[PDB]
Design a protein around this ligand. Structure first.
Ligand SMILES: O=C(O)c1ccc2[nH]ccc2c1
Ligand SMILES: [Mg+2]
Length: 701
């Protein structure tokens, strides 16, 4: 083959070479030791990896049987089989060497496919983002009559943007008197910010919010403010398009936006072989070496402190990498038997290895010496413990100090949810966040209780008692584990990329709920979501939540079973079409173009940023409805066939219709549903991976 033999492993040459030529140089890690380490770690941890996965299946089968055959009983049952484990005594996480962006700063956290270097670079650079751009460019400023986005600058719209931002300034960094809306100028005197108004001048109600400035104190080019640990920069440039129209010559308001970014190897990317992984790893590498270029990485920002000294602010989002979970294998490395190696294990090794570059001078990431790995899709504390051991073992291979590799725990599986405290405990010295991956979580919810009855509709799930309890329980567990000031308590993604007005109105709920972070899909969204952290004092919210237990185990365990006869035929139809459309729209680009996250229009034409989890939900929901006779297989087929041409229309593209059964992507979509009930925990990867690989193969001959 085109493989490299290393002990029991046969490493894809492309990966082998990548690692030797790109990833290893500069790390002082002995290549042979590295590779011997790979082999050893893989041999050592693979069996437990498999055991854990088997354990998921065993638990699921027992739960399946339980339904096929009442809270106290169900709970008692979950406890007997070891699904529901004892909650450990209170503890405080001890995680150290974590950067301020994670321990302290509350703000947006951007998640981006690492395979898309353009996007990844944009994300890394999204630490700072133009508020005017975010406002003008999205519907946060309604495109009502006269204020629409035109081919060119609409002054009326620009004025609304300006006014929006002035109000934001007033609300975030209040003047002692008057409104920023009436500022005619900014100056710095005696290290104090002085805002010129028509009738007089004023300072900030809290001078401490004056963070700095650029240019001459007496006609600064910008003024830097801080509020809730987040920076705001008023750019002053009368001789600019927008500045010329502005009463104080203000060109823009720049917000510190994506404080952190998750470079995603998991649900937002399609990587099914060594070539894919290598592309991912190489972007991750370029990000860490600071030399990724599509466009380049921002340098730090220079400011003059209020007193006149000089200082610097991070110009880049602090990067996490999201590794894949324990489930999938990838033929990037196979053993002598030809068995694919566990991809999670590999990610730990390679992203960890690669991350070392981000810990050192770039011809840079964590100044405190941590590598931040988000671990998705874990089920329960043993799986968390396993990830920690994996990290521990990788750290050894990489010659890294123990606990350098921090873990961002996704709480997005039910068995993690109801054992969240134990999971956090398992990673007490590595955990830098917990996050409610509510989409996967819903997928898991459905699969876990697949046999219980028909589930409520997809759109209903977001408001179901289990998920609201899950959201609160997550925050409670983090806060009780001392996350406040130590680790992020994070919440899920806003997926409606075009519904920014909506995001600004509603996503504020997450910091209000004590989330020191939440996920946005884009730099723009990060900037807008930043607004929320100016309005909400997350530190205070968290302090106020301390000691609260706002969710009971019973609530967490409240299966979202649909009430008897819940839906009219048209509602069932729409739900089926809804799900088939999103499955097809997502899958076709996954399978055909190896794109793992896309703005897929939905049934109502709303642009959703679909990642794999949305696929997990839809396919599981459909599988669940099919399982319980809500819909028939013909209903599914009809909807797939009906929705397919639309998806074909909504799209370098291979149409699915009319010859559906020649379309691997169409077959994938179908398979995802018809086999949904049999996918472990409803995971879509096995099928997506197979189908994408199949497609790649046909794309060859
Ligand atoms: O992992 C997720 O929760 C998720 C969902 C949608 C997305 N769009 C871009 C990244 C991403 C991640
Ligand atoms: Mg997820």
């Amino acid at each position: 083959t085109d493989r490299v033999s290393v002990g029991n492993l046969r490493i894809a040459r492309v990966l082998y070479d990548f690692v030797n030529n790109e990833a290893l140089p500069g790390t002082d890690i002995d290549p042979d030791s590295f590779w011997a380490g790979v082999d050893k770690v893989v041999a050592d941890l693979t069996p437990q990896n498999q055991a854990l996965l088997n354990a998921r299946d065993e638990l699921q089968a027992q739960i399946d049987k339980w339904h096929r055959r009442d809270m106290d009983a169900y709970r008692q049952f979950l406890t007997e089989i070891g699904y529901l484990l004892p909650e450990p005594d209170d503890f405080t996480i001890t995680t150290s060497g974590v950067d301020a962006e994670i321990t302290t700063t509350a703000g947006p956290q951007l998640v981006v496919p690492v395979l898309n270097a353009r996007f990844a670079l944009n994300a890394a650079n999204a630490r700072w983002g133009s508020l005017y751009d975010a406002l003008y460019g999205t519907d946060v400023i309604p495109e009502t009559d006269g204020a629409e986005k035109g081919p060119t600058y609409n002054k009326v719209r620009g004025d609304k943007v300006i006014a929006y931002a002035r109000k934001f300034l007033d609300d975030s960094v209040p003047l002692s008197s008057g409104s920023f809306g009436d500022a005619t100028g900014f100056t710095v005197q005696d290290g104090q910010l002085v805002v010129a108004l028509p009738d007089k001048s004023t300072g900030l109600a809290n001078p401490g919010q004056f963070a700095g400035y650029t240019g001459a104190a007496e006609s600064p080019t910008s003024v830097l403010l801080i509020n809730h640990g987040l920076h705001i920069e008023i750019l002053i440039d009368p001789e600019s398009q927008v500045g010329t129209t502005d009463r104080a010559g203000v060109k823009d308001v720049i917000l510190e936006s994506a404080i952190t970014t998750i470079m995603d190897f998991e649900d937002s990317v399609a990587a099914v072989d060594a070539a894919d992984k290598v592309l991912g790893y190489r972007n991750w590498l370029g990000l860490n070496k600071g030399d990724l270029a599509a466009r380049v990485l921002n340098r730090d920002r220079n400011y003059t402190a209020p007193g006149g000294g000089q200082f610097t602010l991070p110009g880049r989002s602090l990067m996490f990498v999201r590794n894949v979970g324990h489930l999938m294998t990838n033929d990037a490395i196979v053993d002598t038997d030809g068995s694919e190696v566990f991809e999670g294990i590999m990610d730990a090794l390679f992203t960890g290895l690669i991350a070392i570059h981000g810990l050192k001078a770039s011809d840079i990431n964590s100044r405190t010496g941590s590598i931040y790995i988000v671990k998705p899709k874990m089920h329960g504390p043993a799986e968390v413990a396993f990830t920690c051991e994996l990290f521990s073992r990788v750290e050894d291979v990489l010659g890294l100090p123990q606990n350098t590799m921090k873990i961002g725990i996704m709480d997005e599986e039910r068995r993690t949810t109801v054992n969240l405290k134990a999971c956090i405990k398992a990673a007490a010295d590595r955990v830098v966040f917990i996050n409610t991956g509510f989409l996967d979580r819903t997928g898991d919810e459905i699969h876990t209780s697949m046999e219980a009855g028909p589930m409520v509709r997809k759109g209903t799930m977001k408001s179901q008692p289990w998920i609201l309890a899950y959201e609160d329980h997550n925050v409670d567990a983090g806060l009780a584990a001392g996350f406040s000031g130590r680790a992020q308590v994070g919440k899920g993604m806003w997926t409606m990329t075009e519904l920014m007005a909506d995001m600004v109105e509603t996503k504020i709920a997450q910091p209000r709920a004590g989330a020191s972070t939440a996920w946005v899909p884009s730099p723009t969204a990060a900037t807008l979501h930043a607004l929320h952290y100016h309005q909400v004092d997350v530190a205070a919210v968290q302090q106020g939540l301390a000691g609260k237990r706002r969710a009971t185990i019973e609530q967490l365990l409240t299966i979202p079973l649909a009430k008897e006869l819940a839906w009219a035929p048209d509602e069932i139809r729409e739900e089926v079409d809804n799900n088939c459309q999103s499955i097809l729209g997502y899958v076709v680009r996954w399978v055909d173009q190896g794109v793992g996250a896309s703005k897929v229009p939905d049934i109502h034409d709303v642009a959703l940023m679909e990642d794999r989890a949305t696929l997990r939900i839809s396919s599981q929901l459909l599988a669940n409805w099919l399982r319980h006779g809500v819909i028939t297989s013909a209903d599914v087929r009809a909807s797939l066939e009906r929705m397919a041409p639309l998806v074909d229309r909504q799209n370098a593209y291979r149409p699915m219709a009319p010859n559906f059964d020649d379309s691997i992507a169409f077959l994938a979509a179908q398979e995802l549903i018809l086999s949904g009930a049999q996918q472990p925990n409803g995971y879509t990867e096995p099928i997506l991976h197979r189908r994408r690989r199949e497609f790649k193969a046909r794309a060859a001959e």
